[PDB]
Amino acid sequence: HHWGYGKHNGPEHWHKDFPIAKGERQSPVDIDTHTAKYDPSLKPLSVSYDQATSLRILNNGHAFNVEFDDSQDKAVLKGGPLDGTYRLIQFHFHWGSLDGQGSEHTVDKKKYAAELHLVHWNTKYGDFGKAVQQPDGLAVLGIFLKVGSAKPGLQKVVDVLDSIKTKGKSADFTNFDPRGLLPESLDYWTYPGSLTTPPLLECVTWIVLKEPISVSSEQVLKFRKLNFNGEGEPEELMVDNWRPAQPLKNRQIKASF
Numbered sequence: 001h002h003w004g005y006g007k008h009n010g011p012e013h014w015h016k017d018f019p020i021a022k023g024e025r026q027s028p029v030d031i032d033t034h035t036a037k038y039d040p041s042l043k044p045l046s047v048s049y050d051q052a053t054s055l056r057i058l059n060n061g062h063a064f065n066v067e068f069d070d071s072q073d074k075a076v077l078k079g080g081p082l083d084g085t086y087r088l089i090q091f092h093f094h095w096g097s098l099d100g101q102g103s104e105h106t107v108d109k110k111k112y113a114a115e116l117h118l119v120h121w122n123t124k125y126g127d128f129g130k131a132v133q134q135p136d137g138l139a140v141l142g143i144f145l146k147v148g149s150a151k152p153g154l155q156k157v158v159d160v161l162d163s164i165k166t167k168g169k170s171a172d173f174t175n176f177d178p179r180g181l182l183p184e185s186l187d188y189w190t191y192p193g194s195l196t197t198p199p200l201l202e203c204v205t206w207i208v209l210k211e212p213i214s215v216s217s218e219q220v221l222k223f224r225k226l227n228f229n230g231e232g233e234p235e236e237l238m239v240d241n242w243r244p245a246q247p248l249k250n251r252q253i254k255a256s257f
C-alpha cells in the first residue's frame, strides 16, 4: 500500500506514514498575491543552466524525473532569497486530468494546468541525500504551465514519454537544455516549505515564478497518457499527481517584485 494520489493512498492519507505531513512548513500553499510582501532585500535571482547535462528520464510510478549529472559544478541556482549555491539534480511536473487543475501551488486560489519543479541542492551539504536533512538544503524553482501555445523546448520531453509509459521504465535523455522551459520574467514569490511528495521533508526554499509558460493541449495530453502502474498491469492513467494547498501557518510569502 505505497503512497500515491488515489482515494485510499493519496495526500489525505500521507500523514499516517509521514507525520510531518501536518507540519509547520508544508508545501504547496496558496499564494495570496495581495498579502505577499515585496522584499527589497531580495538579491537578483540567478539561473545558470548553460552547462546543464541531463542523463535520462524515469517513470517513478507517480510522475517522471529528468535527471542531471550533478557531480560537477554545473546548472546552478543562486541569488534571490538564497545563500550560497544550489545545484540542479532533476526536474519533474505535476499535472491534472483536466486543464482546470494540476498545479500544486495556487495563485489567489487559481489552479494552473500543471507545474514544473526544478530541484536543486545546497552545495555546502555535499550531496542531495544530506541536503534534504537540512532546513535550507534544497531550492525548488516552480513554474506554472497553462494550456495555449506550444512550448518548443518541451517537445523533446513529450516525445520520449512513449518509451517510459509504465512505472519503473527509464530511457537515455542526454543534451536536454532546461533553459527552453523558462518564462521570460524571473519575477517570483518565495517562502520556506517542504517536499510536496513523501517524505515531505521541510528542507525547501520555494521560488515560484509569477509568469507561467504556455504548453499546447497536445503536449499536456501526452503527459496524461503515462501510467501509474507498471508494464503488464491494469492501466491507471498518470493524472492528478498534485498535492493540494497546505496551511500557511506561521509563514510569510515574499515577492521579488
Ligand SMILES: Nc1cc(Cl)c(S(N)(=O)=O)cc1S(N)(=O)=O
Pocket (backbone or CB within 6 Å): 063, 065, 092, 117, 119, 138, 140, 194, 195, 196, 197, 198, 204
Ligand atoms: N525527489 C523529489 C524532490 C523534490 Cl524537492 C520534489 S518537489 N515536488 O517537492 O519538488 C519531488 C521529488 S519526487 N519524489 O517527486 O522525485
Ligand SMILES: [Zn+2]
Pocket (backbone or CB within 6 Å): 092, 093, 094, 117, 196
Ligand atoms: Zn514536485
